[PDB]
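Narrative progress, year one. The postdoctoral researcher (J.K.) led the effort to move from monomer predictions toward full complexes, under supervision of the PI. The following entry was the first complex the group processed end to end, covering 884 residues in total.
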Amino acid sequence: SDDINQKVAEQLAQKAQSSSLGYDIVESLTVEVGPRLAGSEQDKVAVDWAIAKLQSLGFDRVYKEPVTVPVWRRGIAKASILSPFPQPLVVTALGGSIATPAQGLSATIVRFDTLQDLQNAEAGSLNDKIAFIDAKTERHRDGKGYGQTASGRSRGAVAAAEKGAVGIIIRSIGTDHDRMAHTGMMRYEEGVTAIPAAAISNPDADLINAMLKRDKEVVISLELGSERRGETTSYNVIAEVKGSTKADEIVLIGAHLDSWDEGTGAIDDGAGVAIVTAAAKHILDLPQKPERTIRVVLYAAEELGLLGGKTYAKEHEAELEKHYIAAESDFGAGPIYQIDWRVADTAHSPVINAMKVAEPLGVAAGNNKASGGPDVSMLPALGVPVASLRQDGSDYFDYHHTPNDTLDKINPEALAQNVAVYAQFAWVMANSKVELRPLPPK
Amino acid sequence: SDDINQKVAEQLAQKAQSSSLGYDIVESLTVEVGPRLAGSEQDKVAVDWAIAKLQSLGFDRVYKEPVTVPVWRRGIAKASILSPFPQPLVVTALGGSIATPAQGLSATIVRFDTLQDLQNAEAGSLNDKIAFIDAKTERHRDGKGYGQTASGRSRGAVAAAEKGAVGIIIRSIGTDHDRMAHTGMMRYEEGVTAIPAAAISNPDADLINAMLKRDKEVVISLELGSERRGETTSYNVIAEVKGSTKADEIVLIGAHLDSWDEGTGAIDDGAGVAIVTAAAKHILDLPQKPERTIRVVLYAAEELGLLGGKTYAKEHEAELEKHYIAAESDFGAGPIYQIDWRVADTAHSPVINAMKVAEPLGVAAGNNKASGGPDVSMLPALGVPVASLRQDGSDYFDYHHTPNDTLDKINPEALAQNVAVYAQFAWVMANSKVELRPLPPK
Ligand SMILES: [Zn+2]
Ligand SMILES: [Zn+2]
Ligand SMILES: [Zn+2]
Ligand SMILES: [Zn+2]
């Protein structure tokens, strides 16, 4: 009954709070693998680590599924201001950037408040120059500031090249004022000349601004080494807690296994790997079996455009109708404060009620318009219900995509609360009688 | 009278709180010069900046005095763990390190809790190996943690070479857990083979520890580029507020103009330059003249061993008897909470009383055993009284000697409180009738 399962969920939360497992999994990943950019030598290391780890935890099935991934290698990154006042910058290439010319790159910059301002510039206005997008990212619990500025990183190099720019630097898409350059994916556009593209630290962007405010033009030097290889194979890594009376139905709880390459991928998304794996292990430890199968999916190549998520959706196309609900942890280790849903209108109040078991952990009732996390975000359009278990990310963009994304950034008590809430979610959902389909129109 | 001068001191503090001058001076230095390692091209840039700045503020005399300085240039710094689990490290050369061999340097490490533990190792025990000193620096308002661990940086390369080491890495002498490597001076010893010497970030030292805790040996790669040139000339930069009835007597308020090269030297010691310069300017702005001359000294090459301070003490030897008191701001921008003295026994209670004017700014009475700041610390032995105006440095070693020592680390309200307290100090001391000599035995 709902009552019996509420009490199991209460006990799962107790276990999460008394067990070092969640922390131990992320310590293991960050120490024994470290950064694991898709397509790098560390990609296979992370996959092999995850397979061994899941086997060692005793899951009923542990297997992997191939995902095609591109190969990009980061080389040197050096930048400085040449004039008016010569100074060093702390820079990093945007993910996928081409290298700077062998002859080298030195140019006058032109500052834009935002990507939109750059897109509005006159054609030819950046000939021989480097674009500088200065947009600052606001700090928000829900990360909505990142949502407003991230496109500068994703699309700035295209917009700048369209105006004649020979390069782009951006203010890091970060909420810190640390001397850390934030990387992340960017995309060139077929038809537009690819140009070198880098992020500079927030203090460096402040410095450039201080010089511009003196009615001086700023000239920089930028050097980026990088290399592109042909595509290869990574893997979605999967573990299951075997179901019982409804074993053909799947509750999917996910994270991504890949990361950027300059930190150790601790909060993005080693924390999420640990949260969903530990939650599933606590469930595996129960004397009771869930009705549904619980499937942990550790997705490949999320950083490169949800490639593993998209691959999974297609590979499991015939199985999606039997996916009861899907959710993903990929907003660091901050505690969960709300669960939002994407279920049938007639399921919404029932699932809110089911998850009131998490109220004492600080988790509020939510809406019925959830997108789901990145790797499951394509699944509602295919009919699959999802939940967004909302994490407090107020500090997340201080470290996201920097060399500072390290184990010591994880608050163990907060990590444990996520393990507790996912364990409750996966248990309650794997035993729920609520009909979650059909999803109402978006 | 003491009463009239108490009220001027109160008004000076008002000015400091209502004026952006202190902040503006450090903004100017960090933007228009940036990092200014002694002996680098930026050394002359900083001197020329300071001369122009002091002239622009209208000081009665502005001049400079030569200081011999060594020339060391930092090149590349790359390090990684090769085994058991290959990963990147964030490293920086210790100031003055020789370069690593052209053939390259890869070696097994041996961990030591502290410099003392390394010094206790058996001769030959580090043959072919790299020493790793792991001592963590405790956070303290007075910086006493730095005092306990700093010698690992200063003297570790010598102690490691004595035991056969081919190199040394240290846990950065820092209180942060940021991915920032802290540099700073080290000294080789004539007679002992010079070896490459670097600091790694605190998270990287944690990582190495996590591998060692797995009963694995750790092997690293270390690459350091550096170059030593012959000595050259830097300068102590001096400004004066002209005295009146006691113009032959000097109240010296100082800071150092030089910095390490990877940040912008904002808190070490751009803040101190701004504090003492702004304090003197507020005094210069008064309609009243001080009795004594107030001398702002912006010392050269403090980071390389107090070279400008030592030079000043010798150059001004015949003038020291007329130095009434000396003090230096070189503990960032945190507010002052206490003034300690080094005056005659019979002057102690009188100077405490004189400075009770700063109580409302949060400044407590202090002792009579002050060392004085670094550049004036040699002066008591020459008979010159000093004060230590104690700053709250709880956060100072998060940024000291890192690339993160940037303008945005300065709390403007705290910087203003220092300007207020130095203005009071310099005014009260430049008009005091207390006999400060002779100093009692140390
Ligand atoms: Zn992520
Ligand atoms: Zn990411
Ligand atoms: Zn200093
Ligand atoms: Zn220093």
